[PDB]
């Protein structure tokens, strides 16, 4: 699986950066959220504890899976802004 970043936006009204990317993975299943987040943090040199993956969407009959994620400057702002369900899904919140 190869990750290619299609768009980076710097939102500072909310202290975050929005990342739109794609995963090229022919002949393989949809990558797990853990693996996607790990590779994204490794490539972008981000903080693992202040980044979330909004979604990883696999299309029909395609080897490209689209992906949307965010990276926050501060964990406090991350918790304040992001919903609880997405944090639970990403595993940041033990719940």
């Amino acid at each position: 699986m190869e990750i290619r970043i299609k768009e980076i936006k710097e939102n500072k009204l909310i202290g975050r950066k929005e990342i739109y990317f794609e995963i090229y993975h022919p002949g393989e299943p949809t990558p797990s959220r853990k693996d996607v987040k790990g590779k994204l943090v490794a490539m972008l040199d981000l903080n693992p504890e202040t980044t979330v993956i909004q979604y990883i969407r696999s299309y029909f009959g395609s080897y490209i899976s689209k992906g949307y994620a965010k990276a926050y400057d501060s964990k406090e702002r991350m918790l304040y802004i992001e919903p609880e369900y997405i944090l639970i899904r990403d595993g940041l919140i033990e719940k």
Binding site: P26, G27, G61, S62, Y63, I64
Partner: protein
């Protein structure tokens, strides 16, 4: 009033049993390996809509009329039914066979990725044919001229291996 109801995109013959129409449609279905008569009627309706648009635009004057004429010609050329130098007169000369030739299964058979039209339909339905880098599983899809040359086996299907016995059998034809 009433809300919108999604109407059918194909038309049924005015008379269900006419010898000439029955024989002609039987010939077409046997040749092009269509599953049911509604596919043929859908293609006929597409043709008839094109001809109706051309007829309405021929006797129309206005800026919107010219824009629609140009758009219709461009769309037909993109579909690949008309030559690049065609005019509005050539639209009325189209036939059902022209449209039936642009079906994905027909183009697959012509390119030779399958031995027969039935095999081409099987490959399309099972996902062994890719459009661009994309897999499509609609045998009735009308391919576009701008891409017709990029149709090939999906890179993950067994038919992508020259060794595959079925691929060898297809090739030796």
């Amino acid at each position: 009033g009433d809300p919108k109801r999604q109407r059918k995109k194909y038309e049924t013959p005015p008379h269900p049993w006419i010898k000439e129409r029955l024989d002609r449609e039987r010939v077409l279905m046997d040749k092009y390996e269509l599953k049911n008569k509604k596919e043929l009627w859908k293609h006929e309706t597409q043709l008839k809509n094109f001809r109706r648009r051309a007829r309405r635009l021929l006797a129309a004057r206005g800026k919107q009329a010219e824009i629609e004429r140009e758009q219709l010609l461009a769309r037909l050329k993109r579909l690949g039914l008309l030559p690049e130098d065609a005019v509005l007169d050539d639209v009325l000369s189209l036939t059902i066979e022209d449209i039936l030739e642009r079906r994905l299964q027909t183009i697959v058979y012509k390119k030779g990725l399958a031995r027969t039209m039935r095999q081409a339909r099987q490959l399309i339905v099972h996902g062994h044919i890719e459009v661009n880098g994309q897999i499509i599983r609609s045998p009735s899809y009308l391919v576009l001229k701008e891409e017709e040359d990029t149709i090939t086996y999906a890179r993950t299907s067994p038919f992508a291996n020259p060794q595959h016995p079925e691929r060898m059998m297809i090739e030796k034809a």
